[PDB]
Structure formats: C-alpha cells, structure tokens
C-alpha cells in the first residue's frame, strides 16, 4: 500500500516558489498487480478549519511513454450454454517472418469458463453453465501480451460491448475519503499487458469544503512507472 | 531556564584504517555522571609580553568516556580505527566530529574507555 | 507545562504515574507530606499511589544574587499502596500475609514511564532508595526520588531605559 | 571554498525539512527527508579597470 | 530464570538455599521484611530459612536518562531458624541452652552453594555481616548479603521509521 | 493555507535587508487550485485600542507579466432541455501551419451537462434536464487552454452574459474578518487558463475602526507567482 | 585583529626550470608554531676597527617551514624548481619574494619541509 503526504500549499514548501521542485511523486507498479494508494490531505486541510473533504475526487490518466503494442486485442460474442470457437493468428501482424508461439497464462485465464488452446492459433471456450455476463482471458503471442474479451448473452437479444480495459486504470467506484482524519483511499490497477519501461502520469484533483459549504481545490501529480519484477 | 546539563545521545562510527570497512553509527551510554569536554578553536594562543600574543595553529580536541559495546573490538577504541562521533545534550546542543583519530591511548579494563579524539574541526548547532 | 526545566508534583502524578498502572484508575494523589495524615490517607480504595515532597534542599551554590545559577534539589517520595492477595490451594492450603510480594514489576514499569517522559521532554530524576513494608493486607512500596534543577529569575521585566543621546563637556 | 562560497548564515540556507511526523505507525514507508540548500558560486576575477596617472618630478 | 544479570529472592531461595541444606525439607520462604511479622514467621516447624529484602539502594550513579548505566543495589538478609539440641551424658548432666552453636558449618555450606551457583551462571553476591542470637531453644543466624546489578531498560521497542529516501535542491 | 503577518508600521523601524527592497509578500499558486489566505493585522490594530477591524475591505489585482493567451474564449446560448452544438476551430488563430489537437480535460469538464467532442473541432453539449443556469468547460487546443461558457435559459426569453472569469481572481463574497483576533480570511482562485511563469500583483486595503467610529486605513501588497508542475 | 603575532596565508608558486611549467599559486599551512623568518637588507656588514664597517653586497634570505602539499612533488621543495613565495601575517604585513631559489636543502620526512630561500630583494607592505 502506497502512502503519500500532500503538499500543504502553505509556503515553506519549495521555499515558496524560489525552489519549485514539486517533481511529481513516484509510484512503482508491476503488470497484473492491483494495489492500494492512500493520500493524507491533513497537512493541507487541517488549517482550513471546516468540514474536511468531500466525495468529489477526479482522476486522469495520460501516457508519457507508451510503446504501442504489437498484438491487437479482440472481442467476441456468444449465447448462454453454447460453446465458443475462435482463432488466435489474425491478432499478430508480424512485420518480419518468425514463428508464433501461442500461449495462455494460467495466472490470468478466464473466470467463468474453460479454454482449450488449439495446436495452430485456435481456441475453444466453454462458458460456465448457468451464467451470463462478460469474460476475459490474456494470451501471450510470442511473448507479446494481449487480451480477448467474450460476451455471453442471456439468449434473448444481445449484450453491450465493454471498453477494453487500459494498461493502467483506476476502478470506477472504489475510492473513499475519511473526513475525520483527512485521508483519501483509492485503488490502482495495472493490466497484464502493460509493457515494462512505460511511464504514465496520474493527476488527482481533490476538493475540500469550508464551514459554509464553499469549495477549495487542490491538484497533485504522480508518475506511475510500469516496471517488471517489482 | 537552561534545562539540566547532561548528555542524551552519543553516536560513534568506526572505520578501520586498513581494510576501510565501516561500522555504525552505533549509540553508546555514559558510564558515570561526568560529561565529555571540548575545544573548538583550532588556534591556541601563547602569552607574549606587554599584552601581545602569538597565534599558532593547533588541533580541535575532544575527550569522551563511553561504555564499550560488546560487539566492537576493544582495539577500535584504543586508536586502531578512525572514528566519527556525535554528541547531543538536553538543552538542544549537538557536537559533530568527522575523521577523528584516537590519540594517546589510555589503559582500560574492557568495559569503560576514555577516548581522546583529535580532529580538524568540531561543529556546533547551538540550540534553536 | 509550567517550569520548562522541572516537573511539579501534580504533573509528576498525572503524567508519569497515571499512564502507568491501570489498576489505580488515576488515583495518583499528590499530598503535602506522605505521613501528614495516616487516618485520612487510608480511605481511598486499594490500590492507589501517593506523591509528596519530603524536603527541599540545595546542590552546592545557592546564594540569591540575581546571577549565580541558583541550584536546587527537591527530594520527594512515591508510596504505592497495593492490596496483597493470597493464593488459595483447595485442600485447605493458603499463603500467609507475610509472603513475598513482587515489587520488581512495579519498579520496572515505573522506571519505563519515567524514561519515556525524560525522552519526551528532557527531564531526568535520581533514584535514591526503595523500601517495602506491609501491614495487615496492604503492602507499602516506597520510592524516594530526588530531582535537580535551576530556578529561574522570573521578574524578567522591561529595562530601565533605552540609552541613545548622552551629553558632553570636555572643558 | 572549492564547491561554493562562504555561507552568510549557514543556519538559514541549510534546512532538512522532513515529514516523518505525518507518517503513521500503521504503515512503514519512510524516506521523505528533502533538503534545500542555497548556492553562491565561488567569486572569481573580472574587470580590474585601472587608471594610470603619468607625471614627472 | 528471568533477569539474565540478576536474581529475584524466590529464585535465590529455591536455587541456592533449597538445593543446599536438606534438613529444611525445602522450607525457604521469601518475605517482605524479615521482621515485618514475628508472630506468623515463628510458626513454621523448625528448621526454616527466611529471605527478605532489607532495602533497595544504589551503587553510584542512578539517574534515569535512557542511557546512563543505571546501577542498582539491593540489600537483603538471610536468617536461619535452627533448633538447638542439648546433649545428655547419662550421669545426670546436661548442656545449658546458652552453649556455643556451630554456625561455621552453616556458613561454609551456604557459601559453597553460592559459589557453585555463581560458577554456573556468573552472578555473584557480596557478604556484609553475620549475626547470631538465641531465644528459648532457637538460634537465629542472620546473613546480610548485598548484590549489585545494572537495570536493563525493557521498553526495547521498534523505532519510528526506517529512513530510506533522499531528494535535494539548490535554490537561488 | 497561506498565513501572513502584516508590517505593523509601529515605528516603521524594520531594518530593511539592505539589498532586497521587495515589500510585497510572495505567494505561489498553481493553475486550477483554490487556496485560502489568512493575514493577521494584530501587529498593527492591537495598539490601536478600539473595535478591531471591519469587513469594509478592498482588493485589486493588477498584472505584471501577461504572456497573452493564444486561444480565445467563447460564449454560447441555448434553451432548457434542448441539446446545444458548437465548434472549436475558429477559437485558435494560428500564425504557423500545424495540426490542431482538440482536447477537453476531464478535470475541468462541464458542471451540469455532458460534452461529446467531435472528430475535428466540433462538440455537442447536452445539458442536464430540469436545469437553468450557466456552465463552463475548459478546452486545450494544442496545449493552449481556453474556456467556453454556455448559458441555458428557462425557455422564456433569454439569460444575461457572465464576465468571462479572469486568470487570477478573488471570489466576490468569501472573505471575512474576526475582530476578536484581528484576522482577515480570503480565497485565492487561479483559473486553469493561467500561464506558468507569469506574475500578478494583489493589493489589499484593510480599514480598522477606533473607539468612536473613525477609520484607520492600511495597504499591503503581494506578488502572486503562477508556478506549475506542468 | 591588532596584537596577534602569527601567519595567516602562505602562497607558493612553483616553476620548473626544465620544462617551463607553472604550478600555483597554491596555499600552504604552517607545520608547527615556528614562524617564517626574514632578512630584507641586501648588504651585510662587518665590524672593522674604530667604528668603521665594510659594507659589501649580499642576498635577501628567507626561512620558511611548510607542510608539503600532497599534489606537488617533493623535489620542488628540495631545490629543483624556482619558487615564488608570498606571506601575510595577522597584523597586516605581507612579504613578497619572486623568482627565489632554494639553497642548501635539508633532509625531510615527506610531510614538513623547511625551505631556505635566497633572492635578490624582498618587499614589505607596512599595514596602514
């Protein structure tokens, strides 16, 4: 669990501005992990004697070094109870001539089904009986990692399309704030397809509140460094 | 005011002058009520005649009694190891010393040594 | 706290003795003399601890001259009143009231509280002696501490004047 | 002397602004002991403008 | 045993006196003060040995400052309650109750036990004084020992943080 | 929270730092932040035995550096419930030839509606149903930040025009004064359109009151240095 | 301040009379309490009979003990390079000597040399 103490935006910080520094904080992450981050706004919100923070936090993800992926992702659809078939060769546009070692990691496999990988870029997915939702599984074509999404329908018409989860993301609703101790908690999820060495930037906009209901904004920045083996 | 005289923390770092291996910084404990002594000015004076004085160069010294730590060999206190010491009193003062050299070793009994450190300059931090 | 280089009894009893043993519900009573009354100071329920000054004295130089580092030494004592509890051993066995009482845990954790306080504020005390003595179903555990300090001139007032312009007649 | 010039007031320039107090025992992460120091490069030689005044006896 | 550089009185009685003289059936009693109650400690069947703290004291420096080698000294006294036994010579004679009593054997055996315990564990006591006094038919032999040790702060807890980190800056 | 002490002008005996004439106090601020400032006139008003301070203060913000913006701001009007459409291409007069990366930051999006940015400088603003007021959103054209204000009317006639909020501003009524402790509190807001590196000047005029109801005026100055961690 | 007999700065500039390389001006430190000694008058005198004196030509001498700087070779102090020395006392006096030559070198141990410098003339500055 990461723990950060926020700039109090008082004065001493960065000798006023003379210094400046304020280089965004560091967050080391590993592809596949799902960690938790806490930030203590006390040093900034304690002098502002009022009703602490509010549940109006905002996040943003932008990549400063991305290394676009080699293998593309894919989406498929099927009904409940009926077995699904698919190929795994048309997802790897190879510029050079080489061999394709298809693989499905047992760690990041499906959740409500079973997949049998074919001998030549094929796969058979039997979904879990008496189930209707979405399913994902992560393939490793020649080392390059990608995800395959399957939508099982409740046999009636159709299910919508999920948004193909990003390398780094923050869960939709898993954030919280304790107005008693001025602490904001959230989760940081790293997809198994994030390439080591890439660097993303996360900016957090948190709003406090005075004694009468007005607002006080604060913005902070962190660099998520996608590294391998820790 | 002037809160009680006395020492609070004593830090020592040993560096063997042959293999250049470093140990510390380790703390220590006073063996009795006496306190370490100091001399900061690197220029002693000598009484000339008719009020004048000869200002020559000299060394900043420090005398410090400590209880031997049972994991550091006694030779490291007797002057076979370069030492860096730091003392902090109750009133807030701190006295730091780097590249010290234990000079004039005195016979000890194995549990309480009195080191006569000599260094180029001792630095203060007069309390707030 | 008042007296930046010292700790008056009440402060001793409420900050060093109280956060120690929780079996005395904060009944660390500051008294004038530990034997000022034995008929009144034996009504508070067991257990409880008294704190009282024995005698105030000096530590060398003591003249009162505005600048002589007036040194002082306050000798106080801390008396535990702990209820002795006999051990019963079904078969008609018991332990008499004169059996040994473990004061060691008491001394240990009292010293620990004193050490933590000294580390928190830079104030140290001297241990002098420990006496225990019982009476009926009570054991008296008597520590005698002694505290050195320097008394500060408080007057610390405003100056007589502010100098500047003088006068001169070099006739 | 070699790396920089004589500090005018060394107890103001140097400042080891820490944050340890904030850090609660319910987590282990140490290491925010930022240090901010001033800088005045060693003074050097520059224009030595001279003014000669010829004369005779 | 607790307190690696020391002993508490129960340990003293059960480790140095009990394995010693066997005619006391393991009756080595630790008390608060050896004279706190003479009506109760005169009931146990003879012979029995009492051990009680006389006074807790210092041995030089004792200031409580987290690092000053807090030195301590406890004065305790060991009293033998032994039964004097007169001798009869058949011819109609007896030995008075005030006759000499061989304590030297007792001091000898007590000291041998103490030496053995020290050599086993490396903890030694100081002998101070020896007093013998009789009453009725019981002789009281009171050894007054003294033991020096250093009090080991116990808190020995964890420590704030663990440092790491860095960061610098060269402002104006 | 910034905390400043006032020059008391008791004897005006304040040994200037010889070199270092600046008498205005420095205040660092970041684009988007909304911080709080407290100034303690206690040093100046306490010798003036009277009824302390009064809420009849005054402020002014004259700039020093400007760095004029590249993108202009824009204004639009629409009725309640009806979807609004707009462009974003004529708001960036470029001297040179390059491409135009239209972008709407998620941190400074709308407040009572949704904005769908088109493919090329077009956008559709759908306001929230059952609502009538003003709304703002800050676009980022080629890194340059500008704002768009929309006014939704309750279908009757028309709504007035807001004053196009400035780079550095002090809210209308969020200030206060505590005559018991001689403390003035106010808010410092920096719009996201502020350019890093600029310098503005805020001059404050605070009036204390004697025992009989007269006035004692005091004037102070502060240099707001807009710094930014990007 | 006034009334302090002692040295404050010692500048030495070495020039090799073989390769024409220059090193300095490097500062040095006194090894003990002895001060550098001087003689400015470039004319020695000899006692004749009945108040007269034979004024002949001679050199300006200088005796200077300094700690060898661990960057300059020892040979430069033993009379294998031309030296330019400049001293300043505490009372303001500063004595300059250019293109001197170390005469009659003495044995050294490697950390404290004593140079007997001879030169044409030494100038004094006579603090105001």
Please give, rounded to a whole number of angstroms, the shortest distance from the CA of B49 to a CA of chain E.
47
Q: Kindly state whether A28 is in contact with chain D, defined as any CB-CB distance less than 8 angstroms.
A: no
Q: Give the nearest chain C residue to B88 (CA atoms).
A: C122
CA distance A68 to A72: 10
> Hey, of G33, G35, G91, G93, which one would you mutate to test binding to chain B, going by the most B CBs within 10 A of its CB?
G33
Per-residue burial over G86-123, b if 16 or more Cβ lie within 10 Å, else e, is bbbbbeeebbbbeebebeeeeeeeeeebbbbbebeebe
Per CB-CB distance under 8 Å, the chain F contacts of A13 are: 28
> Hey, of B44, B50, B51, B55, which one would you mutate to test binding to chain G, going by the most G CBs within 10 A of its CB?
B55
Helix (H, G, I), strand (E, B) or coil at B111: coil
CA distance A168 to A200: 8
A168-169 and A25-29: which strand pairing? unpaired
Chains in contact with chain G (at least 3 beta-carbon pairs closer than 8 A): B
C-beta atoms surrounding C140 within 10 Å: 16
CA distance G92 to G84: 20
> Hey, of D7, D31, D37, which one would you mutate to test binding to chain E, going by the most E CBs within 10 A of its CB?
D31
C abuts G (3+ Cβ pairs < 8 Å): no
- Closest C-alpha to C17, from C103, C111, C91, C148: C111
Contacts of D30 (CB under 8 A, 6+ apart): D20, D23, E161, E162, E163, E164, E165
Is E62 close to C100, i.e. CB distance below 8 A?
no
Contacts of B23 (CB under 8 A, 6+ apart): B13, B14, B15, B72, B76
Please give, rounded to a whole number of angstroms, the shortest distance from the CA of E155 to a CA of chain C.
7
CA distance G32 to G44: 30
Please give the structure tokens belonging to residue G30: 């006194």
> Hey, of E157, E159, E160, E161, which one would you mutate to test binding to chain D, going by the most D CBs within 10 A of its CB?
E161
Q: Give yes or no for a contact between A41 and A206, defined as CB atoms under 8 angstroms apart.
A: yes
C-beta atoms surrounding E102 within 10 Å: 6
CA distance A144 to A68: 11
Q: Give yes or no for a contact between F39 and F183, defined as CB atoms under 8 angstroms apart.
A: yes
Q: Considering Cα of A124, then A130, then A134, then A139, what sign does the dihedral take?
A: negative
3-state percent helix, strand, coil for chain F, nearest multiple of 5: 0, 45, 55
Is D32 close to E165, i.e. CB distance below 8 A?
yes
Contacts of F107 (CB under 8 A, 6+ apart): A58, A60, A203, A205, A219, F32, F192
Resolution of the determined structure in angstroms stands at 3.5
CA distance A108 to A130: 22
Any idea what the Cα angle at residue E170 is, between residues E165 and E171, rounded to 5°? 125
Any idea what the Cα angle at residue G40 is, between residues G39 and G41, rounded to 5°? 105
Helix (H, G, I), strand (E, B) or coil at E133: strand
Per CB-CB distance under 8 Å, the chain E contacts of C108 are: 154
Instruction: List C-alpha distances in Å: F166 to F58, F62, F63, F173.
Output: 18, 11, 11, 16
Nearest Cβ partner for E67 among B29, B32, B33: B29
CA distance A222 to A49: 27
Compute and round to an integer the Cα radius of gyration of chain E. 24
Residue C105: phi, psi to the nearest 5? -60, -40
- Closest C-alpha to A45, from A219, A221, A220, A209: A209
Please give the structure tokens belonging to residue G116: 């007997």
CA distance F204 to F223: 12
Chains in contact with chain A (at least 3 beta-carbon pairs closer than 8 A): D, E, F
Q: Give yes or no for a contact between G32 and B54, defined as CB atoms under 8 angstroms apart.
A: no
CA distance A170 to A27: 14
Q: Give the nearest chain E residue to C101 (CA atoms).
A: E32
Nearest Cβ partner for A216 among F3, F30, F34: F34
CA distance F203 to F223: 9
Is E161 close to D20, i.e. CB distance below 8 A?
yes
Q: Which residue has the tokens 């004094």?
A: G124
CA distance B105 to C122: 33
Please give the structure tokens belonging to residue E85: 């036994």
Residue A79: phi, psi to the nearest 5? -95, 175
Cα torsion through E11, E17, E22, E27, rounded to 10: -60
Please give, rounded to a whole number of angstroms, the shortest distance from the CA of E66 to a CA of chain B.
8
Please give the structure tokens belonging to residue B108: 């000890």
Q: Give yes or no for a contact between F35 and F1, defined as CB atoms under 8 angstroms apart.
A: yes
- Closest C-alpha to E127, from E117, E139, E114: E114
Is D31 close to E164, i.e. CB distance below 8 A?
yes
Q: Kindly state whether C96 is in contact with chain B, defined as any CB-CB distance less than 8 angstroms.
A: no
Per CB-CB distance under 8 Å, the chain C contacts of B91 are: 122
CA distance G65 to G37: 9
- Closest C-alpha to C107, from E57, E22, E143, E47: E57
Q: Give yes or no for a contact between F136 and F111, defined as CB atoms under 8 angstroms apart.
A: yes
Question: What would the 3-class secondary structure string for B60-74 be?
Answer: EEEEEEECCCCCCCC
**CA F57, chain centre distance (Å):** 18
Q: Where are the beta strands (DSSP E) in A83-198?
A: 84-87, 113-117, 122-127, 134-141, 144-153, 168-169, 176-178, 183-190
Chains in contact with chain B (at least 3 beta-carbon pairs closer than 8 A): C, E, G
Q: Give yes or no for a contact between C133 and E36, defined as CB atoms under 8 angstroms apart.
A: yes
- Closest C-alpha to A205, from F112, F143, F33, F110: F33
Per CB-CB distance under 8 Å, the chain D contacts of A12 are: 17
- Closest C-alpha to B102, from B120, B119, B123, B124: B119
Per CB-CB distance under 8 Å, the chain F contacts of A10 are: 1-3
Question: Which alpha helices (H) appear in chain F, and where do they start and end?
Answer: 42-45
CA distance G35 to B43: 14
- Residue F145 forms beta bridges with which residues? F140
Q: Where are the beta strands (DSSP E) in F6-104?
A: 25-29, 34-40, 58-63, 74-79, 84-87
DSSP string, C25-68: TT-EEEES-TTS-TTTTT-SPSSEEEEEEEEEE--S----SSSS
Helix (H) or strand (E) holding A225: strand A215-226
Nearest Cβ partner for G90 among B46, B48, B55: B55
Q: How many CA atoms lie within 13 A of F36 on its CB side?
A: 25
Per CB-CB distance under 8 Å, the chain C contacts of E8 are: 102, 104
- Closest C-alpha to E100, from E132, E130, E143, E131: E132
- Closest C-alpha to B8, from B90, B126, B63: B90
Helix (H, G, I), strand (E, B) or coil at A16: coil
CA distance B36 to B103: 16
- Closest C-alpha to F110, from F93, F99, F126: F126
**CA C36, chain centre distance (Å):** 16
CA distance C126 to C145: 6
Q: Kindly state whether A2 is in contact with chain D, defined as any CB-CB distance less than 8 angstroms.
A: yes
Nearest Cβ partner for E168 among D32, D35, D38: D35
Per CB-CB distance under 8 Å, the chain E contacts of C126 are: 62-64
CA distance C78 to C130: 10
Nearest Cβ partner for C148 among B1, B2, B4: B4
Contacts of F227 (CB under 8 A, 6+ apart): A17, A20, A22, F28, F29, F30, F196, F197
C-beta atoms surrounding G79 within 10 Å: 16
Please give the structure tokens belonging to residue A43: 């040093």
CA distance E7 to C154: 49
DSSP string, B26-67: EE---SSS---EEE--S--EEE-STT-EEE----EEEEEEEP
Residue C15: phi, psi to the nearest 5? -110, -25
Q: Give yes or no for a contact between A146 and A69, defined as CB atoms under 8 angstroms apart.
A: yes
Instruction: List C-alpha distances in Å: A138 to A30, E107, G108.
Output: 16, 85, 78
Please give, rounded to a whole number of angstroms, the shortest distance from the CA of D26 to a CA of chain A.
10
G56-57 and G37-39: which strand pairing? unpaired
Is D28 close to E172, i.e. CB distance below 8 A?
no
Nearest Cβ partner for B55 among G4, G29, G32: G4
Q: Give yes or no for a contact between E62 and E72, defined as CB atoms under 8 angstroms apart.
A: yes
- Residue B115 forms beta bridges with which residues? B64
CA distance B25 to F48: 56
F abuts E (3+ Cβ pairs < 8 Å): no
Q: Give yes or no for a contact between C70 and C150, defined as CB atoms under 8 angstroms apart.
A: yes
CA distance C47 to C139: 10
Per CB-CB distance under 8 Å, the chain B contacts of C146 are: none
F28 CB-contact burial (10 Å; exposed 0-12 / middle 13-18 / buried 19+): buried
- Closest C-alpha to A15, from D12, E29, G84, F74: D12
Compute and round to an integer the Cα radius of gyration of chain G. 16
CA distance A195 to A31: 8
Q: Give yes or no for a contact between E26 and E47, defined as CB atoms under 8 angstroms apart.
A: no
Q: Give the nearest chain D residue to A16 (CA atoms).
A: D36
Q: How many CA atoms lie within 13 A of C136 on its CB side?
A: 5
Chains in contact with chain D (at least 3 beta-carbon pairs closer than 8 A): A, E
Q: Which residue has the tokens 């002789």?
A: E139
Nearest Cβ partner for B52 among G3, G30, G32: G3
Q: Kindly state the DSSP code that residue D53 receives in the 8-state scheme.
A: -
Is B51 close to G6, i.e. CB distance below 8 A?
no
Q: Give the nearest chain A residue to F1 (CA atoms).
A: A10
- Residue B38 forms beta bridges with which residues? B62
Tell me which long-range contacts G72-79 makes (C-beta under 8 A, separation of at least 24).
Answer: G72/G14, G72/G23, G72/G26, G74/G108, G74/G110, G74/G113, G76/G14, G76/G16, G76/G23, G77/G102, G77/G105, G77/G108, G77/G113, G77/G115, G78/G102, G78/G105, G78/G108, G78/G113, G79/G103, G79/G104, G79/G105
- Closest C-alpha to B91, from C62, C9, C124, C11: C124
Instruction: List C-alpha distances in Å: B23 to A3, B16, B69, B113, C150.
Output: 32, 9, 12, 18, 39
CA distance B44 to A174: 70
Compute and round to an integer the Cα radius of gyration of chain C. 24
Q: Kindly state the DSSP code that residue G126 receives in the 8-state scheme.
A: -
């Amino acid at each position: 669990m990461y723990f950060f103490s926020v700039d109090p935006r008082n004065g001493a910080s960065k000798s006023g501005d003379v210094c400046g520094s304020c280089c965004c904080e560091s967050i080391s992450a590993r592809p596949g992990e799902v960690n938790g981050v806490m930030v203590s706004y006390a040093a900034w919100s304690a002098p502002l004697r009022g009703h602490g923070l509010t549940n109006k936090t905002t996040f943003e993800i932008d990549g400063v070094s991305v290394t676009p992926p080699k293998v593309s992702n894919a989406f498929g659809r099927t009904k409940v109870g009926v077995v699904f078939e698919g190929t795994l060769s048309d997802l790897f546009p190879n510029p050079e001539g080489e061999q394709v070692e298809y693989e499905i990691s047992e760690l990041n496999g499906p959740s409500n089904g079973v997949v049998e990988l074919g001998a030549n870029g094929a796969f058979t997915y039997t979904p879990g009986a008496l189930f209707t939702g979405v399913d994902r599984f992560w393939f490793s074509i020649n080392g390059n990692i990608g995800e395959y999404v399957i939508s099982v329908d409740p046999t009636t018409s159709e299910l919508p399309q999920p948004p193909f989860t990003t390398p780094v993301y923050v869960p939709a609703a898993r954030r919280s704030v304790d107005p008693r101790t001025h602490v904001l908690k959230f989760v940081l999820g790293v997809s198994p397809a994030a390439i080591p060495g890439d660097v993303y930037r996360l900016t957090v906009r948190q709003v406090a509140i005075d004694c009468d209901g007005n607002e006080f904004v604060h913005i902070s920045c962190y660099d998520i460094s996608i590294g391998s083996c820790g | 005011c002037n809160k009680q005289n006395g020492v609070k923390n004593i830090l020592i770092t040993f560096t063997d002058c042959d293999t250049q291996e470093v140990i510390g910084p380790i703390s220590h404990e006073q063996p009795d009520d006496t306190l370490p002594t100091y001399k900061n000015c690197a220029w002693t004076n000598t009484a000339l005649t008719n009020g004048y004085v000869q200002r020559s160069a000299s060394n900043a010294t420090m005398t410090l009694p400590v209880v031997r730590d049972l994991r550091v060999p006694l030779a490291f206190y007797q002057g076979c190891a370069q030492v860096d010491v730091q003392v902090e009193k109750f009133d807030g003062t701190v006295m730091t010393l780097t590249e010290g050299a234990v000079v004039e070793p005195e016979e000890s009994d194995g549990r309480s040594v009195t080191m006569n450190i000599v260094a180029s300059e001792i630095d203060e931090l007069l309390p707030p | 706290l008042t007296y930046g280089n010292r700790v008056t009894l009440p402060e001793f009893a409420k900050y060093i003795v109280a956060p120690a043993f929780h079996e005395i519900e904060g009944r660390a009573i500051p008294v004038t003399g530990v034997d000022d009354d034995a008929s009144g100071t034996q009504a508070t329920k067991l257990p409880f601890v008294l704190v009282g000054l024995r005698q105030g004295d000096t530590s060398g130089p003591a003249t009162i001259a505005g600048n002589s580092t007036i040194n002082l030494r306050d000798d106080f004592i801390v008396e535990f009143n702990m209820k002795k509890e006999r051990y019963r051993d079904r078969k008609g066995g018991e332990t008499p009231f004169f059996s040994y009482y473990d004061y060691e845990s008491i001394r240990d954790r009292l010293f620990n509280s004193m050490i933590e306080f000294s580390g928190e504020h830079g104030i140290t005390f001297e241990f002098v002696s420990l006496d225990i003595s019982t009476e009926g179903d009570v054991v008296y555990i008597e520590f005698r501490f002694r505290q050195n300090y320097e008394w500060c001139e408080t007057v610390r007032e405003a100056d007589t004047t502010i100098e500047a312009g003088r006068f001169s007649i070099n006739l | 002397g070699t790396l920089f010039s004589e500090f005018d007031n060394i107890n103001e320039d140097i400042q080891l602004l820490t944050d340890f107090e904030v850090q609660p025992k319910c987590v282990g992460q140490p290491g925010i002991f930022h240090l901010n120091m001033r800088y005045r490069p060693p003074v050097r030689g520059a224009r030595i403008n001279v003014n000669m005044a010829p004369a005779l006896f």
